[PDB]
mmCIF file of C-alpha atoms and ligand atoms in Angstrom:
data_model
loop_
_atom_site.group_PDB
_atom_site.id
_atom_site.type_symbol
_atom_site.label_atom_id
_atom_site.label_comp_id
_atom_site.label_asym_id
_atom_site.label_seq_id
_atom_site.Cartn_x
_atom_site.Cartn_y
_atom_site.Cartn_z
ATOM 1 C CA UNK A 1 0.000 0.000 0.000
ATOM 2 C CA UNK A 2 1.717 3.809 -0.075
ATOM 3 C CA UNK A 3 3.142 4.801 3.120
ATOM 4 C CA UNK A 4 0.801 7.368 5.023
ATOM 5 C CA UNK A 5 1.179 10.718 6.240
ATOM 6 C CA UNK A 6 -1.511 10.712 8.794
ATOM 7 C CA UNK A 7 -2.016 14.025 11.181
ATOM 8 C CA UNK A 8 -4.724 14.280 13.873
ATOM 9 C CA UNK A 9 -8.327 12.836 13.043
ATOM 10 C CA UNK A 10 -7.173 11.366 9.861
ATOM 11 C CA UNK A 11 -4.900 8.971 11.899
ATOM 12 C CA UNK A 12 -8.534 7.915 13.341
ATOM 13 C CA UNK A 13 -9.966 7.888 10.019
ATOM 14 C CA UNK A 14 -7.280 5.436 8.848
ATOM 15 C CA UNK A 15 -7.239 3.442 11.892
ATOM 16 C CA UNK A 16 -11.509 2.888 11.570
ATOM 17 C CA UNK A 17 -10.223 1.405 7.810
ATOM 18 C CA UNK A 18 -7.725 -1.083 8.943
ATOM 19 C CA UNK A 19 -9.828 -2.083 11.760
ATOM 20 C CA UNK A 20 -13.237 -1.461 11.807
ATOM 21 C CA UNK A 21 -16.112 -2.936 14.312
ATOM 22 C CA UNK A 22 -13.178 -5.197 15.384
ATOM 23 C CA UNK A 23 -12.223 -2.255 17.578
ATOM 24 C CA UNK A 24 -8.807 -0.115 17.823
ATOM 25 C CA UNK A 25 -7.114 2.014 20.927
ATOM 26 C CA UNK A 26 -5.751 5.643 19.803
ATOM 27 C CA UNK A 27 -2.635 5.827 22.164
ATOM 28 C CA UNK A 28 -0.688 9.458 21.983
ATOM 29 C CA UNK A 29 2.563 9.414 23.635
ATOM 30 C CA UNK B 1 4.695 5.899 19.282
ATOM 31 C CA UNK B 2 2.549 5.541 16.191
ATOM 32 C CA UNK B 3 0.636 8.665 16.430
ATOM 33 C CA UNK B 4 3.661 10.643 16.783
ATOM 34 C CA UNK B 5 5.424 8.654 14.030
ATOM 35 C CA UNK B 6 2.797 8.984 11.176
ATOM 36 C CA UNK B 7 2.024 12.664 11.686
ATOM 37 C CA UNK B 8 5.733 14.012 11.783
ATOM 38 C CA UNK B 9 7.460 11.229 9.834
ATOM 39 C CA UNK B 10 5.414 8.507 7.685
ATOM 40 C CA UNK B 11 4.115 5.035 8.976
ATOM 41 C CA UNK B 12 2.731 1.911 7.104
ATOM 42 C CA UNK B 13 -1.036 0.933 7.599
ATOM 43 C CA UNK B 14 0.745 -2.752 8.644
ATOM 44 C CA UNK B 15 1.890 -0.730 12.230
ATOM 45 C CA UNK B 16 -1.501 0.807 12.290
ATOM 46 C CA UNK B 17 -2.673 -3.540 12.638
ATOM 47 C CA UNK B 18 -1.172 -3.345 15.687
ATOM 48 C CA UNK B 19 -3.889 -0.878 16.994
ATOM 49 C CA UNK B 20 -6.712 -3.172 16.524
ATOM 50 C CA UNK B 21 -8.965 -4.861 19.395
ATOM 51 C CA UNK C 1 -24.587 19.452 23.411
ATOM 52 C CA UNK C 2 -27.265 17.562 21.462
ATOM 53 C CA UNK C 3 -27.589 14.101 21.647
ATOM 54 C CA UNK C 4 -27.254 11.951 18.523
ATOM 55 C CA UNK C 5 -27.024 8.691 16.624
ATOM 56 C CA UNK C 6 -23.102 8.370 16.327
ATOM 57 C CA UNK C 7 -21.996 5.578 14.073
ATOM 58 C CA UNK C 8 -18.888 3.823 12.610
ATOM 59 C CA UNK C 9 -16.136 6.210 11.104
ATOM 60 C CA UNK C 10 -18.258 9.333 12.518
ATOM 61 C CA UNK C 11 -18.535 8.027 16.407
ATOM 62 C CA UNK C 12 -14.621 7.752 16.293
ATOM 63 C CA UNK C 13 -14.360 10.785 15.309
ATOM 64 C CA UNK C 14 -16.586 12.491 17.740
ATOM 65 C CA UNK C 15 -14.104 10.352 20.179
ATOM 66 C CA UNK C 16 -10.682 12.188 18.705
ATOM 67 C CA UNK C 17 -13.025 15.055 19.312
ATOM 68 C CA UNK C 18 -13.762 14.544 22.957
ATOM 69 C CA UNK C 19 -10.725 12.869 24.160
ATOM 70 C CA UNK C 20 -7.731 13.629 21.701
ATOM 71 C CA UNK C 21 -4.391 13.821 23.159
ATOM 72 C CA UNK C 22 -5.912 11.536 26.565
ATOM 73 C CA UNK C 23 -6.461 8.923 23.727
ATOM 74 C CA UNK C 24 -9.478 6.701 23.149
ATOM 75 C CA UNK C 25 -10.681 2.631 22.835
ATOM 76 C CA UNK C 26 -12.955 1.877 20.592
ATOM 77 C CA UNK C 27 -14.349 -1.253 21.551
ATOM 78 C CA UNK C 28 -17.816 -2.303 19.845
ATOM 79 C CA UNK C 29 -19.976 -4.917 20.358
ATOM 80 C CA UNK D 1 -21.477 -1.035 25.089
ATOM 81 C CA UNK D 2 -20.292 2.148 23.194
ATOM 82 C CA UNK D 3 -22.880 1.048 19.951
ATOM 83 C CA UNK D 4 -25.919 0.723 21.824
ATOM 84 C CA UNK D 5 -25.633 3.702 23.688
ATOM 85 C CA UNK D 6 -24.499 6.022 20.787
ATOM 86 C CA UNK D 7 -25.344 4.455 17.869
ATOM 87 C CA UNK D 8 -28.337 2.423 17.917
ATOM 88 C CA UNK D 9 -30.074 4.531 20.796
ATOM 89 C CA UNK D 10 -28.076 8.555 20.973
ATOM 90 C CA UNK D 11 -25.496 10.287 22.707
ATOM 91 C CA UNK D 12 -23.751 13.612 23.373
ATOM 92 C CA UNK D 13 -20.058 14.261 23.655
ATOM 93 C CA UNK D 14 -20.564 13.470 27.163
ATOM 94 C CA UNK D 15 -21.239 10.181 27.006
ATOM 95 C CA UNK D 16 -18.206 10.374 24.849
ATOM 96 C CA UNK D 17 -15.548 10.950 27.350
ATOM 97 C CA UNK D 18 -16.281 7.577 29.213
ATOM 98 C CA UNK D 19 -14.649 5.841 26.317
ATOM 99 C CA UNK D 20 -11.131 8.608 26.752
ATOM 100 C CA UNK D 21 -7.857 7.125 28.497
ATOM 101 C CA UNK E 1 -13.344 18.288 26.906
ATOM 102 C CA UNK E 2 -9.706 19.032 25.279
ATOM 103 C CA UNK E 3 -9.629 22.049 23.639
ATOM 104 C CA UNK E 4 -9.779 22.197 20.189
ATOM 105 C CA UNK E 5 -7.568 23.320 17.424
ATOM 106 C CA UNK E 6 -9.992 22.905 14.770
ATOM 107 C CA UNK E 7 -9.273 24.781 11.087
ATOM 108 C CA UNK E 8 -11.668 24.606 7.885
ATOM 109 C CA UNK E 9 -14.304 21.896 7.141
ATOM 110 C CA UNK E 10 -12.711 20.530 11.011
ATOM 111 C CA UNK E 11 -14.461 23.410 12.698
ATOM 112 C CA UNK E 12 -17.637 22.660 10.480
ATOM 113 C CA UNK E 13 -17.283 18.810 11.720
ATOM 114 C CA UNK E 14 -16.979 19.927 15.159
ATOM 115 C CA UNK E 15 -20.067 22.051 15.114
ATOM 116 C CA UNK E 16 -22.620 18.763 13.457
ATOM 117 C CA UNK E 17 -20.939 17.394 16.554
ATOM 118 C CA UNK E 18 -21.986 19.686 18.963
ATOM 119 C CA UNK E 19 -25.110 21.035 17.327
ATOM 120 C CA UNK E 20 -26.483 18.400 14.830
ATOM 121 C CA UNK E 21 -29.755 18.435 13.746
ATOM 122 C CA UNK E 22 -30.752 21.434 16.054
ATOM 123 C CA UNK E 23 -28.656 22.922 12.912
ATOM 124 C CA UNK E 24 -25.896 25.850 13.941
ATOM 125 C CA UNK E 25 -24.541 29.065 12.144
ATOM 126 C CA UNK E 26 -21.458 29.094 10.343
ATOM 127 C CA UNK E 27 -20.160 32.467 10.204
ATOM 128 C CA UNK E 28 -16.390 33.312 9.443
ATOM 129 C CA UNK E 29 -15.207 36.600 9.941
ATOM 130 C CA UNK F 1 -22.608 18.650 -10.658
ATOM 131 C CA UNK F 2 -24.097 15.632 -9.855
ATOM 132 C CA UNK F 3 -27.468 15.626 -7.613
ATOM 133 C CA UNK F 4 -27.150 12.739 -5.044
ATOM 134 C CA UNK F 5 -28.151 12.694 -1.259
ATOM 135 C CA UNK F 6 -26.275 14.479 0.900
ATOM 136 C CA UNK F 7 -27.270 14.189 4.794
ATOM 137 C CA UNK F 8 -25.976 15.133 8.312
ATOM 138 C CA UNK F 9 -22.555 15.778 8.219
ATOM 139 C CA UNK F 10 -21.797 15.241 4.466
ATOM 140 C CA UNK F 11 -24.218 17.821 3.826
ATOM 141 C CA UNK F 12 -22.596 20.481 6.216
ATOM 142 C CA UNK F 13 -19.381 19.631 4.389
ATOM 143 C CA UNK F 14 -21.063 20.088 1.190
ATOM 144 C CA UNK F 15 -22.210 23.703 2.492
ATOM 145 C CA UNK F 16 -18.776 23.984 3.833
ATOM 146 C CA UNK F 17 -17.137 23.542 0.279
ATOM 147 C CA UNK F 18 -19.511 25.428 -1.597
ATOM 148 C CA UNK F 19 -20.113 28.213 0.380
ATOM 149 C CA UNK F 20 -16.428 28.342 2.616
ATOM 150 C CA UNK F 21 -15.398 32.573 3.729
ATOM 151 C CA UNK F 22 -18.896 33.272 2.785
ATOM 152 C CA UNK F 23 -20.121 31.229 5.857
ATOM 153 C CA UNK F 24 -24.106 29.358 5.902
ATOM 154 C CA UNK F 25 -27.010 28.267 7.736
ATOM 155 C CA UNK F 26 -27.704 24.760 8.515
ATOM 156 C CA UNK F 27 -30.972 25.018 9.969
ATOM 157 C CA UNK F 28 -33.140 21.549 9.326
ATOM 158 C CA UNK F 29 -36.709 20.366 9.733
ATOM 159 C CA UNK G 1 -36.268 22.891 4.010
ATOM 160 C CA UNK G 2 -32.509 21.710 3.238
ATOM 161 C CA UNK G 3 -32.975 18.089 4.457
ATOM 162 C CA UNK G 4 -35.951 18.000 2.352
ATOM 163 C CA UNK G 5 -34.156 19.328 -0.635
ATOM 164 C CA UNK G 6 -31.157 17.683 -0.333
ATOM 165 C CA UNK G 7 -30.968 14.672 1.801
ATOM 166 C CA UNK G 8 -34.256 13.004 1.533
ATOM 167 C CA UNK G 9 -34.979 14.309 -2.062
ATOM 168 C CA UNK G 10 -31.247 14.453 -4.159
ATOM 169 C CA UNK G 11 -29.732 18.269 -4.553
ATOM 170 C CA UNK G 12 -26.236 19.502 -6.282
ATOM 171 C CA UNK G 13 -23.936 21.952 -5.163
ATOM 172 C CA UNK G 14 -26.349 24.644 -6.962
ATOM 173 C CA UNK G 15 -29.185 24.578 -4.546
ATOM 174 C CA UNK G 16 -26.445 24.656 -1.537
ATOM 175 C CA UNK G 17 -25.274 28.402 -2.571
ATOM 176 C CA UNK G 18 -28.970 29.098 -1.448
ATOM 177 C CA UNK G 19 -27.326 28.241 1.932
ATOM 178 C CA UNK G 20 -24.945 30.441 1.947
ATOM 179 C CA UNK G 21 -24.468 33.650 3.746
ATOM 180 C CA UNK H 1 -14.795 35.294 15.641
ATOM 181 C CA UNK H 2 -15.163 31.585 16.460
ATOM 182 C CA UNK H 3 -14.217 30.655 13.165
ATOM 183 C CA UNK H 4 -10.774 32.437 13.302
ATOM 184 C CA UNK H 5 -10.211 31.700 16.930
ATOM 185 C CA UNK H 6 -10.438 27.701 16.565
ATOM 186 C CA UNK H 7 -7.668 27.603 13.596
ATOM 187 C CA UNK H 8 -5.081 30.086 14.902
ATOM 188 C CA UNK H 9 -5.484 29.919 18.555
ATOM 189 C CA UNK H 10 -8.026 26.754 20.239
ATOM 190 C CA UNK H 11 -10.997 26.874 21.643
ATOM 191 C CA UNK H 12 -13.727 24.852 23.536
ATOM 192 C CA UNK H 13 -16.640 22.774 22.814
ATOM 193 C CA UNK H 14 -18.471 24.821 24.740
ATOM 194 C CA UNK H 15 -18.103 28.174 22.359
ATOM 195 C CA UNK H 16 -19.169 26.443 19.570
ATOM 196 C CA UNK H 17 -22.301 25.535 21.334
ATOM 197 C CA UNK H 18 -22.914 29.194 21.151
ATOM 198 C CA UNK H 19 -23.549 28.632 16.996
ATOM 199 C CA UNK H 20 -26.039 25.918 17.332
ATOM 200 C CA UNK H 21 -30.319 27.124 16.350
ATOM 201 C CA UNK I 1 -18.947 29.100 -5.644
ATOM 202 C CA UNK I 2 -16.253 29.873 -3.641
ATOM 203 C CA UNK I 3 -12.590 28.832 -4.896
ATOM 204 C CA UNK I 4 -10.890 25.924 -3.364
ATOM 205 C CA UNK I 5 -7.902 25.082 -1.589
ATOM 206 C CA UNK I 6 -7.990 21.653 -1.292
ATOM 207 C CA UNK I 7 -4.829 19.130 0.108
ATOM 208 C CA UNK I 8 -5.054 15.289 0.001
ATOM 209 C CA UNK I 9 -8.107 13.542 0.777
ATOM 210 C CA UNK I 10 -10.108 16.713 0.743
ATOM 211 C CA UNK I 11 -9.616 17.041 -2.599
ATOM 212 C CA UNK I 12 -11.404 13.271 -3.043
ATOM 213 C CA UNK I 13 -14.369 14.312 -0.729
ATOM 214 C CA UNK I 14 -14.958 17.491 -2.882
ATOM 215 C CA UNK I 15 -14.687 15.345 -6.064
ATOM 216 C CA UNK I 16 -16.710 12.897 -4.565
ATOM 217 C CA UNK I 17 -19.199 16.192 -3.835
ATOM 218 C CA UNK I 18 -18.819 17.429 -7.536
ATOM 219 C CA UNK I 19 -19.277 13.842 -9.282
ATOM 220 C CA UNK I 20 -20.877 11.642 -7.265
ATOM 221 C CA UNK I 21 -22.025 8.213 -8.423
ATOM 222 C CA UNK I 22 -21.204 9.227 -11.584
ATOM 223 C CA UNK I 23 -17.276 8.319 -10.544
ATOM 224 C CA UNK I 24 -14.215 10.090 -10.923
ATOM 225 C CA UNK I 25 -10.618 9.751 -11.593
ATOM 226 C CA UNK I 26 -8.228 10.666 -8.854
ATOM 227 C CA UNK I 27 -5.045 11.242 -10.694
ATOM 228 C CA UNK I 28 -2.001 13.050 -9.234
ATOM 229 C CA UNK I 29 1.271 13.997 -11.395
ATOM 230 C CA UNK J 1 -7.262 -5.593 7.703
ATOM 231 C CA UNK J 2 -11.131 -5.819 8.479
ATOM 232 C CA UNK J 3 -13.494 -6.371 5.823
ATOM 233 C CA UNK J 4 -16.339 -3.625 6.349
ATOM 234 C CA UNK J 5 -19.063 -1.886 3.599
ATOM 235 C CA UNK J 6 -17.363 0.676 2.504
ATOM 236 C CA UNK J 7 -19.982 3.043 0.602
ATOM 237 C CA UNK J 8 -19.750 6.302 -1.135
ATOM 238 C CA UNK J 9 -17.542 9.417 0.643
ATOM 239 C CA UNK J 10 -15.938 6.328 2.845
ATOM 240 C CA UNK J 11 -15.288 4.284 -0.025
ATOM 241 C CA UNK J 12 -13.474 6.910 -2.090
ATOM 242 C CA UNK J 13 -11.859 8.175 1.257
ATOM 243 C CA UNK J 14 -10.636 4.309 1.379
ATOM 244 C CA UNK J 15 -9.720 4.476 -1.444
ATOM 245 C CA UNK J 16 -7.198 7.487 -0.675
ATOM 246 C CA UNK J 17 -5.374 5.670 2.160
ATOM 247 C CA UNK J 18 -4.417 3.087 -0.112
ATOM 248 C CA UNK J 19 -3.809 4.094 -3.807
ATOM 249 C CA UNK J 20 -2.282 7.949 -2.353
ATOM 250 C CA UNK J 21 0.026 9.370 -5.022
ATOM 251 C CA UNK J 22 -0.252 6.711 -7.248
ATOM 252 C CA UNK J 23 -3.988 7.595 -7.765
ATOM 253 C CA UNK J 24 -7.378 5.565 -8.637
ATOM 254 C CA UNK J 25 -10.335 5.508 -10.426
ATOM 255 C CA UNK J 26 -13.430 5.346 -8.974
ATOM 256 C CA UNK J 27 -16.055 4.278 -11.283
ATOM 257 C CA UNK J 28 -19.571 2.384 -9.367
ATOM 258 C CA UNK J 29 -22.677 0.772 -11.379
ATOM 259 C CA UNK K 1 -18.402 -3.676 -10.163
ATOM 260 C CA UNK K 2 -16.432 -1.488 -7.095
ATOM 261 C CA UNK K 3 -20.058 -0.869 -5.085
ATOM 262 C CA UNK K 4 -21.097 -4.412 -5.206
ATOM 263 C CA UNK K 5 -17.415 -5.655 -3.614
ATOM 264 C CA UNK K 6 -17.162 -3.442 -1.121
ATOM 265 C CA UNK K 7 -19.869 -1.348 -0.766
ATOM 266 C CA UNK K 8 -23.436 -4.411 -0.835
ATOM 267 C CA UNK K 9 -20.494 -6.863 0.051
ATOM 268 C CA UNK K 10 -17.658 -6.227 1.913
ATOM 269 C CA UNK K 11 -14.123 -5.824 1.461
ATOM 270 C CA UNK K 12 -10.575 -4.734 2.978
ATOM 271 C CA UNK K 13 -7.889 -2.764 1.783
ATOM 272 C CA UNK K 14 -6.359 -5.821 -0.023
ATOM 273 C CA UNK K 15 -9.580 -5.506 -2.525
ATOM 274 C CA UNK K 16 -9.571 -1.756 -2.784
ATOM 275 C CA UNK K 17 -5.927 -1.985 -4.531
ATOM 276 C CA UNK K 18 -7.712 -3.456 -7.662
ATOM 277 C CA UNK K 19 -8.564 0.275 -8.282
ATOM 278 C CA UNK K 20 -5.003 1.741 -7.888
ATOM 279 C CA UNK K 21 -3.548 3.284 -11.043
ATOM 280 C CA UNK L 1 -2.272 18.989 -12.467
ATOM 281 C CA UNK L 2 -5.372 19.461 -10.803
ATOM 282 C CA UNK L 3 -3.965 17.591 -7.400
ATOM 283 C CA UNK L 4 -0.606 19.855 -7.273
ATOM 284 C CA UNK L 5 -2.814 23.050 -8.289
ATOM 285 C CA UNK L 6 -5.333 22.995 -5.723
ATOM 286 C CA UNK L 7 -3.033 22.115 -3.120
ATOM 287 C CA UNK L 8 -0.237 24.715 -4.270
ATOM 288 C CA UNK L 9 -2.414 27.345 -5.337
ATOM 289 C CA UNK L 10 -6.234 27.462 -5.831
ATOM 290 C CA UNK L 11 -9.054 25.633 -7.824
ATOM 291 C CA UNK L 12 -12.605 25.301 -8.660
ATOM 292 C CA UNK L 13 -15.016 23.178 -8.577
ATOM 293 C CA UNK L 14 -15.965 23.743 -12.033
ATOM 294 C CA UNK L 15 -12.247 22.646 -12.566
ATOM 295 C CA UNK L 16 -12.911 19.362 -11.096
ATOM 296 C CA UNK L 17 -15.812 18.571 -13.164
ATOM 297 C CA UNK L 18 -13.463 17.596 -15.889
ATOM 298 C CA UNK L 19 -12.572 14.237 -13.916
ATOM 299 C CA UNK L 20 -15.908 13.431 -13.468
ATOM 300 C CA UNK L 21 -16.436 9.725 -15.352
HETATM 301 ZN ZN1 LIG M 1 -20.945 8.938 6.591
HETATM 302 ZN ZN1 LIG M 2 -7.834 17.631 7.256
#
């Protein structure tokens, strides 16, 4: 796939496409 | 981590697997 | 705030939007 | 859980925040 | 709630969020 | 320009594109 | 109104400048 | 206004309730 | 309308706003 | 990688994340 | 075609490539 | 192109028309 540049809620948006209704955790460090 | 990583560098949707329930 | 039906892609956003830097689980069903 | 209460039935954004680390 | 650093169609977003079908005003300066 | 349904937040982004500086109303039923 | 127009009936970006401010 | 504040500065939830009919 | 300035995958909603279910071609140089 | 319905804006947004800079086509029915 | 694979049916990112330039 | 131009500079909708199928 291309590599991702992925700022604020479109790091959310892309993490609802890998996963889904399987769930995901949004961690900041 | 990863949120850090794809937002000042670049990451690969395979790391963002690792986020997954 | 008005209360809503919140689904899929849109309910994790409205959860960047609440909790951002704190971080978030989504954890469906 | 979070799809019942916001989803299928409705929520605010403070309903919301139980679901923040 | 964090606060928000919310620019273009991410302040509209925000405001469905926050308002939804009560509807809201829109109104750049 | 295509005419196609456009509802709840995908409509205020519509509005958002179309109408930007100039600001709107979204004030439903 | 709008969601009449435009969500439950279909509408193109012409009928949103009406909308506008 | 609200609109300006959000992007250059931040602001809170609860302004933007202030916009909502 | 207003003019647009519109970066990565806002420039694919407002093409999907513009065109619809008619499709489009998303095609970068 | 879930497998979800992926419909209209979210398809194309999808679509985005993984085709980038290379670009896509999107072209339903 | 695209709507019926991923859209009526359902598919991952794996699928979505088929549409890649 | 139309990518580069309305991320560099500016663009129209009745610009992005043309890549309507
Ligand atoms: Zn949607
Ligand atoms: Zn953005």
């Amino acid at each position: 796939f291309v590599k991702q540049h992925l700022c604020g809620s479109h790091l959310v948006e892309a993490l609802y496409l890998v996963c889904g209704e399987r769930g995901f955790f949004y961690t900041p460090e | 981590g990863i949120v850090e990583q794809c937002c000042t560098s670049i990451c690969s949707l395979y790391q963002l697997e690792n986020y997954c329930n």
